[PDB]
Structures are given as structure tokens and as C-alpha cells.
Amino acid sequence: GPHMATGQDRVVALVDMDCFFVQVEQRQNPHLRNKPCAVVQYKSWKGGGIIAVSYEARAFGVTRSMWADDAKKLCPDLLLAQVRESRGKANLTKYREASVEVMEIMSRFAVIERASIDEAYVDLTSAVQERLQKLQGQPISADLLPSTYIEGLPQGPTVQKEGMRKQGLFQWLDSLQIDNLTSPDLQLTVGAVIVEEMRAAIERETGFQCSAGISHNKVLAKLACGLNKPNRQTLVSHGSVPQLFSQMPIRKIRSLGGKLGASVIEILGIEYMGELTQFTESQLQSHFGEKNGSWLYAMCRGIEHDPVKPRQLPKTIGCSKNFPGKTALATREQVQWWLLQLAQELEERLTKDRNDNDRVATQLVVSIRVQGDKRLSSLRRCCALTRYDAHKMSHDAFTVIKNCNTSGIQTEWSPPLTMLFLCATKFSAS
DNA sequence: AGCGTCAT
DNA sequence: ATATGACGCT
Ligand SMILES: Nc1nc2c(ncn2[C@H]2C[C@H](O)[C@@H](COP(=O)(O)NP(=O)(O)OP(=O)(O)O)O2)c(=O)[nH]1
Ligand SMILES: [Mg+2]
Ligand SMILES: [Mg+2]
Structure with a gap:
């Protein structure tokens, strides 16, 4: 109408x-340009996990989330650049x-x-x-x-x-x-x-x-x-x-690659985004809720209103490391040493951020994952971030998680920690 | 506030 | 076999 x-x-x-990380390494090392090339992290783990792949290496089937040793079976001439490692x-x-x-x-x-x-x-x-x-x-x-x-x-x-x-x-x-x-x-x-x-x-x-x-x-x-x-x-x-x-x-449209997209497929009995046009908005709202319903009714017609937000900087500055399987942190001394590694990198980055962008983070979030729980975050607690200081920040992060330790022993940690995550949030203009 | 989803 | 960031729900 x-x-x-x-x-x-x-x-x-x-x-x-x-292939951004590969381009960054290829600019730096001319020997890598126009070659099947990939960027990995952690050499000692099956050659390292691939996080970026050049299109020449993609043509052999090399992909993100591949171990480098496996990637070489597909592509024997695959060149590699590894991510900087600091504080482990x-x-x-x-x-x-x-x-x-x-x-x-x-x-x-x-x-x-x-x-x-x-x-x-x-x-x-x-x-x-x-x-x-x-x-x-x-x-x-x-x-x-x-x-x-x-x-x-x-x-x-x-x-x-x-x-x-x-x-x-x-x-x-x-x-x-x-x-x-x-x-x-x-x-x-x-x-x-x-x-x-x-x-x-x-x-x-x-x-x-x-x-x-x-x-x-x-x-x-x-x-x-x-x-x-x-x-x-x-x-x-x-x-x-x-x-x-x-x-x-449907899974190819942004935000529909997870559980919501699957339920659209399953509940409605469809495969393609265009098939969504035969449903009234009220029908869609009825299945996937009011917000998703509206969004889907319009999106299958090519209509979306989400504005380009004026924001060139991240809203949070974060630090995490996984401690998989057997490397899970099982002593109190281990947990404190790693929170300190994390706190130190975060301090470096926050100090930079303060000088560059004239702002300060005011809240610190501490995330952990426990052995066995496949929820990629098991627990999240927060405290004030009043000083850009690694020792205080790791000390505070420990304070707010130490009660998760079910171990009756003084020096032990249970269950062993499979992830540590420190995140600086809540910025104010400095 | 703490947790869940989606994503690169 | 094995790092971060945005945002929604309650
Ligand atoms: N550390 C880490 N970095 C990642 C991961 N996934 C992606 N990155 C990093 C590495 C990526 O280079 C960067 C950009 O992500 P994309 O645009 O989705 N992939 P690219 O730009 O390489 O190729 P193209 O866009 O042409 O398809 O994010 C991950 O799981 N971990
Ligand atoms: Mg890209
Ligand atoms: Mg990208």
C-alpha cells in the first residue's frame, strides 16, 4: 500500500x-603474503588452535577451530604465525x-x-x-x-x-x-x-x-x-x-544461528527466511514472544530498524583463560597466581585506555567455570574497581570467589577451576 | 545483580 | 583434546 x-x-x-589476523601477520612478515597461511594460539597443543585462515589455505579446507597439526594433513605447505603470549x-x-x-x-x-x-x-x-x-x-x-x-x-x-x-x-x-x-x-x-x-x-x-x-x-x-x-x-x-x-x-541471518533459529525451523516447519512471510505478526509473536515476533515479521520482508550506534570503543575490557581438563586449577596458590596474571594484563590495558580515551572503568566482574559444568560460565560476581592496580584487583577478585571452594583443606581448591575471567565494565568520563 | 544467548 | 564482546531476561 x-x-x-x-x-x-x-x-x-x-x-x-x-582474514584479519592473517593479514596483520602478513603485513608484518612479507614471507607469508599470498600463501596458504593461518594464525594459531598455543604451539604445544597439536600445533595450536587456528583462529584465522587465509583464503589460499581455505581452498584446501583449512578452517577456524582446527588444530594446526590436523590442518597440515589437508595442507602440507600451510604457513603459520602464532599469537603473542604474555604471562602464560x-x-x-x-x-x-x-x-x-x-x-x-x-x-x-x-x-x-x-x-x-x-x-x-x-x-x-x-x-x-x-x-x-x-x-x-x-x-x-x-x-x-x-x-x-x-x-x-x-x-x-x-x-x-x-x-x-x-x-x-x-x-x-x-x-x-x-x-x-x-x-x-x-x-x-x-x-x-x-x-x-x-x-x-x-x-x-x-x-x-x-x-x-x-x-x-x-x-x-x-x-x-x-x-x-x-x-x-x-x-x-x-x-x-x-x-x-x-x-x-534461516540460520544465516544475524542472531538466528542459535536456539531461536532452530525453534523457528522446528515449530513452524520451515527452512528458508522467505517462508516466514506467510505468518501474521500475531502468530509470530505468539511463538517466539512479542519482541522476536515483531522482529521476525519485519525481517523476513527485509525490514529492520536497529540503529547504527555511535560507539567506536568497546564497552568492557576483558581477560580470560581456559584451564582445560587436567590443567584445571586445583590449589589456592594456582588460582591466586593466575588471577594476578589476568589482573596484570588488564591493568596494562586499562591504563592505556584511560590515557587514550579519557575514561575509567568503575566495576570489576569475576567469572569462573568449574570442572564438569559445560555452561561456559559457572558463576559471576562483581566488586568495585577503584584503582588500576593488579594486586588489589586480583586480591578483590579472589575475595569475591573464594567461598566457592568446597575443599575442607586450607591449601586446596575444589572443584578445580577450568576458567578465569576478569572484566572491567561501567565506564565514566575521566 | 546474576545468568543465558549469540557471535567473531 | 585442550579469547573475548554485546546484549536480553528476570
Ligand atoms: N582468539 C580468538 N579470535 C577469534 C576467534 N574467532 C574469530 N577470531 C578473530 C580472528 C579473526 O581474524 C577476527 C575476525 O573475525 P572474522 O571476520 O569472523 N574471521 P576473518 O576476518 O579472519 O575472515 P573473514 O572475515 O574474511 O571471513 O576475529 C576465536 O575463537 N578466538
Ligand atoms: Mg573479517
Ligand atoms: Mg569480523
């Missing part, structure tokens, strides 16, 4: 770095810093929401209308979109990938209505021109390549980004949604 909202009011992009744990300082390089450049173009160490959303609505003016009324050249895919195109009456790409892009452009400054597709198109520039800026100034999605909301931008990785960007228009969603498994 004429009163029904189509969710075309915003231009939103998600930019995600291609993984230290991610180099990637956090690399992330700041990327985030800052993105910030010159628009207000961003940092979504992970590697990706950010971008509300390009204002930048689009500003460019749209000063473009007078000139058409948009395909030269301006040299890595952009139009989802759903080409269609209708080349055998190579770049061949298909341009044909899709030509079809799209040749249909475009530059007469109308207020057309959503035009908005998206100009949004995509800006992301080309932004992505060019990131690579020119950091050496890092990335992919992006351009659409009208965060969920479509995120999904779009993944459609043509690596080193490419994808425009998912409102019109492209019904065909796209008609074979799109």
Missing part, C-alpha cells in the same frame, strides 16, 4: 576485514591495535559502530544525500564501482566472475533513476560509491583488504558483506530481498 513502510529510509554498510596467556594486543588503524580511517567518512575487533557498521544516510546534491544530476559511472556486486544481477535475455559482475552492474546502472534524488536504489548506489572510496582508503593507508555489504539496515548489510568475500563489496537492494530470502536458510 501507500501507508506501508518498506524500510528504505537509511543507507547502512557493514565493513569486515578479510594469549595476548591480542597487536590485532586490537591493528583494529584501531582500520576504525579510525572509517571514522573520517561517517559515524561507526564497532561490532567486533574486525568489523564496523556505517550509517551513510547523510553522506549519501550530501554527495547526491553535489553530483548535480550526473549519471553514475561503472568506473566508480570497480569491486561492487549487485545481488540478483545479471538476469534475463560471460563465463568468468568479473564478466558476470560487470554485466550485473551494467544492468543495474542502466536501470537507475538519477532523475529522483529520493529513490532508495539511487541512495544505495551512491552509498556503494562511498564504500569503494572508504575501502580504498583502508587499503592505501594500512595494507589491509576488506569486504563490505551495502543495504538499508544492519542485518542485510552484514549478510551482503559475506556474499562476495574476499576483497569485494555487495549491494543488496530492497527489491532483491524476496528471491534472495527464498533459498536463504
Whole structure:
């Protein structure tokens, strides 16, 4: 109808770095560039656990969450770089810093929401209308979109990938209505021109390549980004949604990869996101509750209102280490020594944070997991964080958990601890 | 406040 | 065989 909202009011992009930790190591070590390559943590455990994989190594089937020794069976020439270890744990300082390089450049173009160490959303609505003016009324050249895919195109009456790409892009452009400054597709198109520039800026100034999605909301931008990785960007228009969603498994939409998505599948008897359109909102609200119901009713139509939040910094600063199986911490002396390792790294990072971003954390959260409980957090207690001091912070963290020790013995800890997690939260401006 | 979900 | 971050529910 004429009163029904189509969710075309915003231009939103998600930019995600291609195999980010590997790129960071490849920039540093030229010997690793353009090779099957992976980043692991903890060498002595089956060669280390893989957390990032180059696309050359992906083509042998190497994946995240693989042990390196297993990965070598698939890929014997697989090169590896290992994560820095400090105080007996993984230290991610180099990637956090690399992330700041990327985030800052993105910030010159628009207000961003940092979504992970590697990706950010971008509300390009204002930048689009500003460019749209000063473009007078000139058409948009395909030269301006040299890595952009139009989802759903080409269609209708080349055998190579770049061949298909341009044909899709030509079809799209040749249909475009530059007469109308207020057309959503035009908005998206100009949004995509800006992301080309932004992505060019990131690579020119950091050496890092990335992919992006351009659409009208965060969920479509995120999904779009993944459609043509690596080193490419994808425009998912409102019109492209019904065909796209008609074979799109539900688990692929953001926040639907867990238990909620499974229950949508199980309770409703469906597989694809598009199948959700045949249910009334009240029906959906009835099954998955009021909030999820509303969200699903609109999302299966390509409509989502979640705003890009202005927030380039993390809201919490955290430290954890798992103590699996037999390395579980079973003495009081062990627990105190590790809380101190954690407290020391956290102090280092909080002091940095205070000087960089003019703020202080005020609350400390202590998380632990106990042997046998598969709940990845068994218990969570908190205290005041009044000083950036490792010894006090570990002493406090111990105070608030020490009563979990069921061991009648003075010097023993039971049940043995399989995770320690320290988290600084509740920031105030300093 | 403490716990559960989803995710990179 | 084996590290963090955002946010929702009660
Ligand atoms: N320590 C740790 N780091 C992780 C884990 N999972 C991901 N990371 C880190 C390592 C990742 O590099 C980084 C970004 O996560 P993605 O974007 O989902 N994977 P990438 O960027 O490598 O490839 P592409 O995006 O092109 O598919 O987060 C984990 O379980 N543990
Ligand atoms: Mg990435
Ligand atoms: Mg990412």
C-alpha cells in the first residue's frame, strides 16, 4: 500500500576485514603474503588452535577451530604465525591495535559502530544525500564501482566472475533513476560509491583488504558483506530481498544461528527466511514472544530498524583463560597466581585506555567455570574497581570467589577451576 | 545483580 | 583434546 513502510529510509554498510589476523601477520612478515597461511594460539597443543585462515589455505579446507597439526594433513605447505603470549596467556594486543588503524580511517567518512575487533557498521544516510546534491544530476559511472556486486544481477535475455559482475552492474546502472534524488536504489548506489572510496582508503593507508555489504539496515548489510568475500563489496537492494530470502536458510541471518533459529525451523516447519512471510505478526509473536515476533515479521520482508550506534570503543575490557581438563586449577596458590596474571594484563590495558580515551572503568566482574559444568560460565560476581592496580584487583577478585571452594583443606581448591575471567565494565568520563 | 544467548 | 564482546531476561 501507500501507508506501508518498506524500510528504505537509511543507507547502512557493514565493513569486515578479510582474514584479519592473517593479514596483520602478513603485513608484518612479507614471507607469508599470498600463501596458504593461518594464525594459531598455543604451539604445544597439536600445533595450536587456528583462529584465522587465509583464503589460499581455505581452498584446501583449512578452517577456524582446527588444530594446526590436523590442518597440515589437508595442507602440507600451510604457513603459520602464532599469537603473542604474555604471562602464560594469549595476548591480542597487536590485532586490537591493528583494529584501531582500520576504525579510525572509517571514522573520517561517517559515524561507526564497532561490532567486533574486525568489523564496523556505517550509517551513510547523510553522506549519501550530501554527495547526491553535489553530483548535480550526473549519471553514475561503472568506473566508480570497480569491486561492487549487485545481488540478483545479471538476469534475463560471460563465463568468468568479473564478466558476470560487470554485466550485473551494467544492468543495474542502466536501470537507475538519477532523475529522483529520493529513490532508495539511487541512495544505495551512491552509498556503494562511498564504500569503494572508504575501502580504498583502508587499503592505501594500512595494507589491509576488506569486504563490505551495502543495504538499508544492519542485518542485510552484514549478510551482503559475506556474499562476495574476499576483497569485494555487495549491494543488496530492497527489491532483491524476496528471491534472495527464498533459498536463504534461516540460520544465516544475524542472531538466528542459535536456539531461536532452530525453534523457528522446528515449530513452524520451515527452512528458508522467505517462508516466514506467510505468518501474521500475531502468530509470530505468539511463538517466539512479542519482541522476536515483531522482529521476525519485519525481517523476513527485509525490514529492520536497529540503529547504527555511535560507539567506536568497546564497552568492557576483558581477560580470560581456559584451564582445560587436567590443567584445571586445583590449589589456592594456582588460582591466586593466575588471577594476578589476568589482573596484570588488564591493568596494562586499562591504563592505556584511560590515557587514550579519557575514561575509567568503575566495576570489576569475576567469572569462573568449574570442572564438569559445560555452561561456559559457572558463576559471576562483581566488586568495585577503584584503582588500576593488579594486586588489589586480583586480591578483590579472589575475595569475591573464594567461598566457592568446597575443599575442607586450607591449601586446596575444589572443584578445580577450568576458567578465569576478569572484566572491567561501567565506564565514566575521566 | 546474576545468568543465558549469540557471535567473531 | 585442550579469547573475548554485546546484549536480553528476570
Ligand atoms: N582468539 C580468538 N579470535 C577469534 C576467534 N574467532 C574469530 N577470531 C578473530 C580472528 C579473526 O581474524 C577476527 C575476525 O573475525 P572474522 O571476520 O569472523 N574471521 P576473518 O576476518 O579472519 O575472515 P573473514 O572475515 O574474511 O571471513 O576475529 C576465536 O575463537 N578466538
Ligand atoms: Mg573479517
Ligand atoms: Mg569480523
